[PDB]
């Protein structure tokens, strides 16, 4: 049921809007907040044990989100029968790892794009909610998941932006724990880069 999932969803959205510090962890100390970046990166990591991604490109832009391009399959994109929406749209809205859906709830915008089967799918989130189906813009050779996210300061207070070294000490630990995953960071704010291999 196109409807029942539509139901489930909003209600579980709603169950993390007003729980948000069960879900992600403290929204005031930035734990819950650099957490945000975290559960996407550990998403990717799957796919990296999976044996399809092999680089993970975390970025902080100069408005203070976070993009995370892996190098994966892409997530699956097909219509899903029983929820009737793209695969990827059940992976990014159905609470369950935290899961992605919990990141997407407390992000004011979500903008995912997929790359997959020669072709480049978007779609964008405001709380969690879709604007549109996931739709086609164009064509690609390569394969792969970006997800991008505004946090929402109406969930997080105090610590707002995102500390470089909190992100680097984090994924300089991920790639130790998955060898042979290769984990970049880049600051869009002042140019840092970073590159962590085990
Ligand atoms: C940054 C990021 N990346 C991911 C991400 O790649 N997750 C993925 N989940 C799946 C689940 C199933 C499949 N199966 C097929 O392709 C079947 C083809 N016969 C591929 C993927 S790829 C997520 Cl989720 C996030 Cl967030």
Known sequence: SYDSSSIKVLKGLDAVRKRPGMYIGDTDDGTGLHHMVFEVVDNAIDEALAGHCKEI????????????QDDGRGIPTGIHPEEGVSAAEVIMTVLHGVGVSVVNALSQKLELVIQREGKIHRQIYEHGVPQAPLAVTGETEKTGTMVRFWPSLETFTNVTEFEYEILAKR???????????????????????????Y
Do not use: P
């Not at 975390?58 to 993009?67: F, L, P, R």
């Not at 724990?177 to 960071?185: D, E, T």
């Open 171 to 197: 994924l300089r630990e991920l790639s130790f724990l998955n060898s042979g995953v290769s984990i970049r960071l880049r600051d869009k704010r002042d140019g840092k880069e970073d590159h962590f291999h």
């Open 57 to 68: 490109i975390v970025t902080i832009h100069a408005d203070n989100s976070v993009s995370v």
